[PDB]
Amino acid sequence: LRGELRVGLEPGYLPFEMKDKKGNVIGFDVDLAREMAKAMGVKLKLVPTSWDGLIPGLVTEKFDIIISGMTISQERNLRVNFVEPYIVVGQSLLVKKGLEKGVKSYKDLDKPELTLVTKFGVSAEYAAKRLFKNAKLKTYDTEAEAVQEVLNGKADMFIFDLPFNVAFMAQKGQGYLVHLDTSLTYEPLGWAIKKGDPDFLNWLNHFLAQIKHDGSYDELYERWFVDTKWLEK
């Protein structure tokens, strides 16, 4: 690769990709992508894309790599190759205040009179249909649209990857929601690239091992997952 590293993501998975107040795209994966560019001695470009355009975009060479906090699922892994996992994740729940009472398991929210909302075409959806099966399930176009349904009284509860939930609790959720943080799925996230390229994978993996033993990774992880400065966009 010469010139520039084109990375496609979709903004809105806090704290991985979000849109600035200035409209600039920032986050863990964005910093991850600057490092990669640097370590490759090459220019970074981001291409923003909707979740559903990510894999075809990659497969079609709209970009070279995906770094969107994407679950290494066996389905998707048939269309692209995944680098090794750089963070490990699972789905928790955000609930309206009050229905959290006496819940010992997620399983007793799997009730027919309850409405569960996530975003369409994502891990949590697939989790939701595997996990629940009683509760009504509705899906939406964004993480934001979806938690709004429960915030505004339209839904009872919201499911998503755990770090979106804890980012959210910090920025808006503390007062009005409750986070049931017990993880419900084992979801490694890796970067995806298109098949037929083992040389890239070699490079990507080593470059992952480096930052994980460099102290570089742990800084970024501190920045986006423990620290709270970032929250003023």
Ligand X SMILES: N[C@@H](CCCC[NH3+])C(=O)O
**Which residues of the chain form contacts with ligand X (CB under 6 A)?**
10, 12-13, 51, 69-71, 119, 122-124, 143, 161, 187, 189
Work out what residue 12 binds among its own copies, ligand X, none; the CB cut-off runs from 5 to 8 Å by kind. ligand X
Task: Output 82 or 217, the one with its CB closest to ligand X.
Answer: 82
Q: How far apart (Å, rounded) are the C-alpha atoms in residues 25 and 222?
A: 19
From the CB of 183, what's the least distance to its own copies, in Å?
7
Helix, strand, or coil (residue 187):
strand
* 3: contact with its own copies by CB under 8 A: no
Q: What does 156 bind: its own copies, ligand X, none (CB cut-off 5 to 8 Å by kind)?
A: none
SS3 222: helix
Alpha-carbon span 81 to 201, nearest angstrom: 8
43 binds, among ligand X, its own copies, none (CB under 5 to 8 A by kind): none
Report residue 109 as tokens.
């929210």
Contact 207, 83 (CB under 8 A): no
Residues 6+ apart with CB under 8 A from 102: none
**What single letter denotes the amino acid at residue 89?**
V
Site string for its own copies, 72-91 (x = CB under 8 A): x-xx-xx--xx-----x---
Q: How far is the CB of 26 from its own copies (least distance, A)?
A: 21
Which of the choices its own copies, ligand X, none does residue 229 contact, using the CB cut-off of 5 to 8 A by kind? none
* Contact between 22 and its own copies per CB under 8 A: no
User: Which of the listed partners (its own copies, ligand X, none) does 122 bind, with a CB threshold of 5 to 8 Å by partner kind?
Assistant: ligand X
End-to-end alpha carbon distance in the chain: 32
Q: How far is the CB of 119 from its own copies (least distance, A)?
A: 20
Q: Is 188 in the site for its own copies (CB under 8 A)?
A: yes
Distance between CA atoms of residues 213 and 215, nearest Å: 6
Closest distance to ligand X from the beta carbon of 213 (Å): 15
Instruction: Name the DSSP letter for residue 136.
Output: E
Q: Which CB, 134 or 202, lies closer to ligand X? A: 202
Q: What is the number of other CB atoms lying within 10 angstroms of the CB of residue 62?
A: 14
Smallest distance from ligand X to CB 105, Å: 22
Query: Which is nearer to its own copies, 75 or 232 (by Cβ)?
Result: 75
| Nearest distance from C-beta of residue 221 to its own copies, angstroms | 6
Burial group, residue 153, by CB count within 10 angstroms (0-12, 13-18, 19+): exposed
**DSSP 8-state secondary structure symbol assigned to residue 176:** T
